[PDB]
Amino acid sequence: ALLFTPLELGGLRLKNRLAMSPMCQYSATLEGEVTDWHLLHYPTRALGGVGLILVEATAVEPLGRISPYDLGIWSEDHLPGLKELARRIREAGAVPGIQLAHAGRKAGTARPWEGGKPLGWRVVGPSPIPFDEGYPVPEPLDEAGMERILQAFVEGARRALRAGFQVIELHMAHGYLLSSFLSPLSNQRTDAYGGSLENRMRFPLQVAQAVREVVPRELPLFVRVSATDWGEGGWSLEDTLAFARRLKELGVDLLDCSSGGVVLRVRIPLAPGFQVPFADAVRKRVGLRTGAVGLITTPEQAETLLQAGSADLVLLGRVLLRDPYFPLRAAKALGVAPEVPPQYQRGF
Amino acid sequence: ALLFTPLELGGLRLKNRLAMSPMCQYSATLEGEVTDWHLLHYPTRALGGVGLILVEATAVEPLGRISPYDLGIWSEDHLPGLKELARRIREAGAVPGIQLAHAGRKAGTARPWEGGKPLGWRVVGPSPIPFDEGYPVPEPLDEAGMERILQAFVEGARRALRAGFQVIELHMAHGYLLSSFLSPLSNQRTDAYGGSLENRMRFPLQVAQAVREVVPRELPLFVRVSATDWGEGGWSLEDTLAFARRLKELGVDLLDCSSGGVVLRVRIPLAPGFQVPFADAVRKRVGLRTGAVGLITTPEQAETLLQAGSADLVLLGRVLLRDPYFPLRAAKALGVAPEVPPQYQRGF
Ligand SMILES: Cc1cc2nc3c(=O)[nH]c(=O)nc-3n(C[C@H](O)[C@H](O)[C@H](O)COP(=O)(O)O)c2cc1C
Ligand SMILES: Cc1cc2nc3c(=O)[nH]c(=O)nc-3n(C[C@H](O)[C@H](O)[C@H](O)COP(=O)(O)O)c2cc1C
């Protein structure tokens, strides 16, 4: 059972191949601090059996937030709450990781259950092109802006390591800041950071590199990407291949393969494992380890994409929101005896 | 779906008919205090959707414990811990209840996962008959001792109310103190508290009467009983019916119907729903509301026993240890849009 076989990354060993995918909770304080919500939400899924938890998008600057209730990491005062959250994650038996994020032209919307409407922030972008109707026109970054944000990512990693997180993921997916540099749908710059594939990769590759320099080799650096934006003439799987090789050269440990999010009006052919092809290709054609994600909900299905070499790691989101103990019960279903809290032995 | 229709009990309205059955976690301090374990374990199940959480057997007197890490309620110093627990359960959307307990002749054994051996306490009971081989001979209570234990239950129940608990269950099941007074495999006293059925019910009814007096009518008092002991000549369903009638006269709101526990060398015909005929008999022949429990694992099963009139309340134990969010996912399986935390809406 490969799902429940340990997985070496950097100098770690994940006790299994299930990870909790990052999922925004919109439940931080207004100054972006960890609250009781997270201290219950994450250790629950850790008792639940995943080997790795990736804490939701965590803004590396106040204007990089999605919502006013996002986790932040732009401040030393975020350290105590973050350090407490990684500690309860480890104590409930998983490796604590965290996704560092900047929301670019999609920054500044209400929580989704409070309407999810733009708030009117000075959001920033590659090109002065609104995400969709009703959204602000991002102002396009000059080079000093880019360098400020790269530092914010670099200092956010340093701060996450000090908080005791052992796996950092760089969010470069879903139409947020770095993803929007990648795609020509959102990026129409005519300087060195737009136009060609190489140019559109430039800034995101500078960020990975500068973050990689401050994360020692023992701790894995993930990058999440939208493997395609699903748009006519948009970013494609082939582009993703090119971007993958450059990440591998820089020493990124694992590409976490999502898709979409750059613009709205595109056809997304959603289905169980619809993004699994993207993990499989990168892994087999570039030789960079991949995380698969997207409508993975069943133990036989996670096992199978593993057996097939489509990925190294299986990431779960939604199934864990409604069934946080999925992984303990999944093992049994694959004929593996689950390691469960002694308290709970008589439930298995 | 009856399973998701409210239930009025006393002055309060349970939001659905599912309840977390009481389950020892053996995770308190040596002095019996709430710890971080409980403050994670219980609210997880509250978020997971039960209307009622019944906190595990909580001993009204130190020698009344099963393990040395049982919750206690014999001291005011228990109050801030118990209060924080009831608070967090309520804040996660369930009504907090607690089972008041005294382990009797089965008192003082090690944690299950540490061997569960007797530990040599001066355990007490109705008669000097060990539970099984290996176990101390209990000291027979005198009137004074019975009065002392009666008053610990009373102060127990008073303390629980001041902590914010809104349902109190009396543990008279499972071979523990009050259950050993009911069964003639454990009660062979020759005074007013043994011999005849009337005598054998005598102490247990006095406790139920004394607790009922300090628990406002607005707030439901439950009693758990072992509806049979499964022993030749032992406590029987017919006995349970007569006990139930008396409990009902005293103003007990609901009978929680379990079985077994008194002695070890009996055969229990385990099957899904096996204790359901006990709840069904009491409820239809006595008119006392009942809670059904025992290998209930499935929304359709839980709904069907309610449709049948077999019980008013469905208690879940082990399925909630392995699947704490069962009830949210059970509403949907039953055609009901679950109320789930806004954070989790997209998982459903
Ligand atoms: C409520 C919610 C919040 C999410 N937040 C993030 C996020 O913080 N960063 C990210 O890369 N993806 C985020 N996602 C996407 C999930 O991580 C996951 O990639 C996606 O839901 C597909 O996996 P699934 O079908 O297993 O849920 C979020 C998804 C949901 C439903
Ligand atoms: C670990 C564990 C602890 C238990 N603790 C108690 C207890 O505190 N009080 C009680 O009356 N029964 C207790 N029981 C029995 C359960 O509450 C329940 O009646 C029984 O397990 C059958 O229901 P189930 O099949 O849904 O688990 C416990 C059972 C287990 C599994």
Query: What CATH number did the domain enclosing A101 receive?
Result: 3.20.20.70
Q: Would you mind telling me the total number of residues written for chain A in this entry?
A: 348
**Interatomic CA distance for residues A179 and B157, integer angstroms:** 59
- Rounded to 5°, the CA angle A342-A348-B5 comes to 110
Cα–chain center distance at B296: 16
Task: State the angle between helix axes of B326-333 and B299-307 in degrees (0 to 180), rounded to the nearest 10.
Answer: 70
Count the alpha carbons within 13 Å of B41 in the hemisphere toward its beta carbon. 24
B297's tokens: 């694992």
Measured in Å, how far apart are chain B's first and last C-alpha atoms? Answer: 19
Number of separate domains in chain A = 1
Question: In chain A, which residue ranges form alpha helices assigned H by DSSP?
Answer: 36-47, 79-91, 143-162, 177-182, 197-212, 237-250, 276-281, 299-307, 318-322, 326-333
Nearest CB neighbour to B324, from listed A43, A112, A324: A324
A252's tokens: 């990124």
Q: Residue B44, class by beta-carbon neighbours within 10 Å (0-12 exposed, 13-18 middle, 19+ buried)?
A: buried
Tabulate helix, strand, coil % of chain B (nearest 5).
40, 15, 45
B6's tokens: 């409210």
Long-range contact list for A211-217, CB < 8 A, 24+ apart?
A: A211/A100, A211/A153, A211/A154, A211/A157, A211/A168, A211/A170, A212/A250, A212/A251, A212/A252, A213/A154, A214/A154, A214/A157, A214/A158, A214/A161, A215/A157, A215/A161, A215/A168, A217/A10, A217/A11, A217/A251
Closest CA to A325 of B271, B44, B166: B44
CB A176 within 8 A of CB A135: no
Exposure class string for A247-265: b at 16+ Cβ within 10 A, else e: bbebebbbbbbbbbbbbee
CA of B189 to the centre of ligand 2 (A): 29
- Give chain A's count of helices (H) and strands (E): 10, 13
Closest CA to A22 of A203, A293, A281, A301: A293
**Interatomic CA distance for residues A180 and A175, integer angstroms:** 5
Measured in Å, how far apart are chain A's first and last C-alpha atoms? Answer: 19
- In DSSP terms, A258 is beta-bridged to A226
Provide the annotated active-site residues of B. Answer: 176
Backbone angles phi, psi at A131, to 5 degrees: -60, -45
**Interatomic CA distance for residues B13 and A283, integer angstroms:** 55
> Where is A136: in which H helix or E strand?
none
**Interatomic CA distance for residues A158 and A211, integer angstroms:** 9
CB B185 within 8 A of CB B262: yes
- Annotated binding-site residue numbers of A for FMN: 21-22, 24, 57, 99, 224, 295, 317-318
- Decide if A43 touches B, using CB distance below 8 A: yes
Which residue type occupies B120? G
Domain limits for position B27: 1-348
Task: State the angle between helix axes of B202-214 and B237-250 in degrees (0 to 180), rounded to the nearest 10.
Answer: 30
Other residues' Cβ atoms within 10 Å of the Cβ of residue B190: 9
Handedness of CA B236, B242, B246, B252 (dihedral sign): positive
Nearest ligand, measured from the Cα of B101: 2
Q: Which pairing describes strands B124-125 and B167-172: parallel, antiparallel, or unpaired?
A: unpaired
Closest CA to A124 of A137, A142, A138, A108: A138
Resolution limit, Å: 2.2
**Interatomic CA distance for residues A180 and A176, integer angstroms:** 6
Q: Which pairing describes strands A7-9 and A12-14: parallel, antiparallel, or unpaired?
A: antiparallel
Instruction: Note whether A346 contacts B41, CB cutoff 8 Å.
Output: no
Which residue type occupies B345? Q
Alpha-carbon torsion, ordered B188, B192, B193, B197, to 10 deg: 80
Q: Would you mind telling me the total number of residues written for chain B in this entry?
A: 348
Instruction: Note whether A40 contacts B37, CB cutoff 8 Å.
Output: no
Q: Residue A294, class by beta-carbon neighbours within 10 Å (0-12 exposed, 13-18 middle, 19+ buried)?
A: buried
Cα–chain center distance at B56: 7
| Nearest-Cα residue of chain B relative to residue A28 | B343
Task: State the angle between helix axes of B202-214 and B143-163 in degrees (0 to 180), rounded to the nearest 10.
Answer: 30
Alpha-carbon torsion, ordered B72, B75, B76, B77, to 10 deg: -70
Task: Identify the residues whose C-beta falls under 6 Å from ligand 1.
Answer: A 21-24, 56-57, 99, 171, 173-174, 224, 258, 293-296, 316-319; B 346
- Phi/psi zone of residue B231: left (φ > 0), alpha (ψ -120 to 50 degrees), beta? beta
Residues 6+ apart with CB under 8 A from A343: B25, B26, B27, B37, B41, B321
- Decide if B116 touches A, using CB distance below 8 A: no
**Interatomic CA distance for residues B340 and A275, integer angstroms:** 28
Other residues' Cβ atoms within 10 Å of the Cβ of residue B69: 22
Strand ranges, E, within B36-132: 52-59, 71-72, 95-101, 124-125
Furthest-apart CA pair in chain B: how many Å? 64
A50's tokens: 């995943």
Instruction: Note whether A323 contacts B329, CB cutoff 8 Å.
Output: yes
- Phi/psi zone of residue B276: left (φ > 0), alpha (ψ -120 to 50 degrees), beta? alpha
Is A135 annotated in the active site? no
Instruction: Note whether A322 contacts B340, CB cutoff 8 Å.
Output: yes
- In DSSP terms, A139 is beta-bridged to A124
Q: Residue A327, class by beta-carbon neighbours within 10 Å (0-12 exposed, 13-18 middle, 19+ buried)?
A: buried
